[PDB]
Amino acid sequence: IARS
Amino acid sequence: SLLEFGKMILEETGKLAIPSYSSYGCYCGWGGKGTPKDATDRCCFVHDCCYGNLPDCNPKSDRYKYKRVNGAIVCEKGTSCENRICECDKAAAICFRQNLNTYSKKYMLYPDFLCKGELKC
């Protein structure tokens, strides 16, 4: 998971 | 999807996307401002732009399929959004691999206030  | 991107990141780099890339610099895992800190952060900047190219897609949640052909990522055909999301993620994962040589832990948990100014995609 990250956001971006 | 974000989980798939994380799996791709781990496959390429050997680092867990959380925590190694989820809070890195100005653009990874979070963020829309700042001069990217280094090449790895620029991978994130470009990836953010790449997702920004797809306003009617849902990259965090929409799943795509990919395979490997002698190590290389090949995005398999899904919906148009899925194909485009996969290409964004593939590029970023390759970019992270290409820039491990300069990854720096000092940019994990990088504080927001050190990221200011817009940089156009």
Side-chain angles (χ1 to χ4, degrees), chain B:
Chain B
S1 70
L2 185 57
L3 278 177
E4 291 161 351
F5 182 38
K7 167 179 181 278
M8 194 182 279
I9 291 165
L10 173 63
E11 283 169 347
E12 287 295 303
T13 70
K15 293 182 173 286
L16 296 167
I18 307 172
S20 293
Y21 292 101
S22 52
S23 64
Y24 187 106
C26 292
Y27 289 89
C28 302
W30 237 75
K33 53 211 314 214
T35 296
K37 303 310 301 184
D38 68 359
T40 288
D41 202 14
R42 290 190 292 273
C43 301
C44 293
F45 176 84
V46 172
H47 184 248
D48 293 347
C49 295
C50 197
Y51 281 4
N53 293 332
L54 309 176
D56 294 341
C57 304
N58 294 281
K60 295 194 305 281
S61 61
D62 192 358
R63 300 193 189 186
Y64 54 75
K65 297 292 187 180
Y66 72 97
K67 62 184 177 180
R68 304 259 169 188
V69 181
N70 244 25
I73 296 166
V74 178
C75 291
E76 292 172 279
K77 189 177 175 169
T79 68
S80 297
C81 278
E82 287 160 358
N83 299 336
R84 299 163 80 191
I85 295 162
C86 185
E87 289 296 335
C88 291
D89 285 3
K90 170 180 175 182
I94 291 168
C95 184
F96 292 150
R97 177 70 187 90
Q98 186 155 56
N99 291 295
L100 282 172
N101 71 151
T102 63
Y103 179 102
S104 180
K105 292 177 294 88
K106 74 181 165 257
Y107 296 132
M108 293 170 61
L109 305 175
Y110 196 66
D112 179 81
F113 80 107
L114 294 172
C115 298
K116 302 300 142 200
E118 31 215 307
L119 175 62
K120 301 185 183 176
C121 290

